Amino acid sequence: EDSDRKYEEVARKLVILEGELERSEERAEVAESKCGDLEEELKIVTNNLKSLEAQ
Amino acid sequence: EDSDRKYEEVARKLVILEGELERSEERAEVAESKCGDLEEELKIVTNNLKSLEAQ
Amino acid sequence: TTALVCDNGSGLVKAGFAGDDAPRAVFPSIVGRPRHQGVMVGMGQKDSYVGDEAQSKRGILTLKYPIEHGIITNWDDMEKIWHHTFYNELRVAPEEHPTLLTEAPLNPKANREKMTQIMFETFNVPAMYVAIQAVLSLYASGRTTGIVLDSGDGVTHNVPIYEGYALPHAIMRLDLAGRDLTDYLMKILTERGYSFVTTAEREIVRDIKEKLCYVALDFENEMATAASSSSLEKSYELPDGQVITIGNERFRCPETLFQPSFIGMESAGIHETTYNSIMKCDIDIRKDLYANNVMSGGTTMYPGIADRMQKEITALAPSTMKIKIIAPPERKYSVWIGGSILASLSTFQQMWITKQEYDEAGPSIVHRKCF
């Protein structure tokens, strides 16, 4: 009974940290895709910068 | 022994689940640092392009 | 003064000072040499790394354990190992430090002899002594009876000790250990498409083994389970991404210790050699030996090994005997711990082999009761 209670406890731990890894991963990866988007946008604006630097 | 090895197995699953949910927030927060500095340089380059748009 | 305790072993050298609580320095007992030519002049690359340095430079080296099965084969690499230990892992002048050395039972006497000789000549210690790994492992567990099943990386022996007496005729050495399990895992990992052949990626496989493998309480049931479900598969990320997965292997690999036939060996499994070593001992001391199966060495650190071991050796022994398996949570260093304990004694301070005595009697002195 002791191990079963602590086993259901650590099972709550299982489900919560699993779902937590899941949505932290989703948040992270969407934010990083957005970051790569803004990165290529910075590339675009630097292209514009150089084209203007052509005086 | 059933309860024993079951709790031991799920406790190892929990310890690895922790060993990953720990740096879950880490690779979350590095993403946000990236977002921040990228938006910053976005603003900088948008100001610079406009300043060079003169003639 | 303080005594040194260097437990060579295979795979892992572990050293420290007597009286301490854990070996100060622990590093792989390998020697690497570059196998490409190198083009950047002024880089001044040395010719042979050693220990953790080599373990880090793995990508461009060729690693070679200088101990094969408890026996030392390449003496120059062994001297390099010892010198690096003394002068970099401990920063100690070995001239003023009696050192304690360990070796498995049933080894070539020339091994231990040359060990003593090099110790007294090259490093010039004041005294030394060679001890049996299993005796120390018993010391570290506070016992004074019971059989001990050490299983390091190269060798695997049982030494039944009772009341401080050792019954040598029942010692059971067996040359199946962690390195063999690593090789068998390298082999069966091919049947998923994973190929590790280099002496470097053998270390990768060793890590995979230390992390994912475990003993299965019942082999057939676990096999049928892994066949039906997929709840046993776990993944693992190599040093260049490309995560891999292993299922059946996780418990097929360490199962070898109980069915050595998997690697073509003919001897009987761990439980069997243990029970046989018991039965070879006198009948009056079999109950205590049943009750005190000590375990040590890194290879006895698989999740579940103690339970499976108890199951088997219970199936073999009579029903009215209490089987117990002393498996501490730090048993990997039990040999070094026991060595520190022993070297720290004072009733031991007259068992050393003084350099004067060796100069008087030559390396043949070791086999003499200056043991």
Next chain:
Amino acid sequence: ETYLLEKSRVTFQLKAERSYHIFYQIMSNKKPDLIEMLLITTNPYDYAFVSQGEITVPSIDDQEELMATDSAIDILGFTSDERVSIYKLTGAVMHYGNMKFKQKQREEQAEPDGTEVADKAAYLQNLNSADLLKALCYPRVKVGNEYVTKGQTVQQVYNAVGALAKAVYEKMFLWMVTRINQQLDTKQPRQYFIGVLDIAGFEIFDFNSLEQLCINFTNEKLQQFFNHHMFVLEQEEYKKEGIEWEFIDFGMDLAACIEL
């Protein structure tokens, strides 16, 4: 300077004596403010560390001594929180005795049964109780460049907590002495001092033990010290006296008993 403060008193004493004063002092109820604050009861027989000898002495009560030594503290360089800390630490020392541990059924590994006294002692130091009992029954030592968790048997855990209470009590003693000598100094640039030193004498009894042997050994060292000093002075005086006698050193006869 305090020197060779006895240690084993705090957790053991023979039948015909007791532990140090402060415990029974707090047990004396001249101020139940502490008795409530240190969560202790009044019956000393409820606390095993101090209850293995004679608790009440028929010479002096411990009540008056409470405020006596309290004032002794106050007049010296002690803050109030300092004193409540001293009291809480003594109370935790007293509490450790009642921490109970039981062997697991499938091993020799110790484990706790009731966290009650654990909770009390842990709160008395403002640190988690579960964490405390865990780190008692699952220590870990630095091996190489990582850590491994050693195992513990019940007896080992009892020895551990005994050493813990002993060490914290002796550290309290040494640091309160530090504070005392910190308040009493005068800032004049000083030089060579004088030495006033009392010590327990060559106290031999009808039933000796460890502490008695240690005291006798200290007195052996002192006797040989002053034996050799008198030797050099007295003897090496007579160099000028045109004659010498008793040419051997005088401390070299206590050496036989010291080396043993």
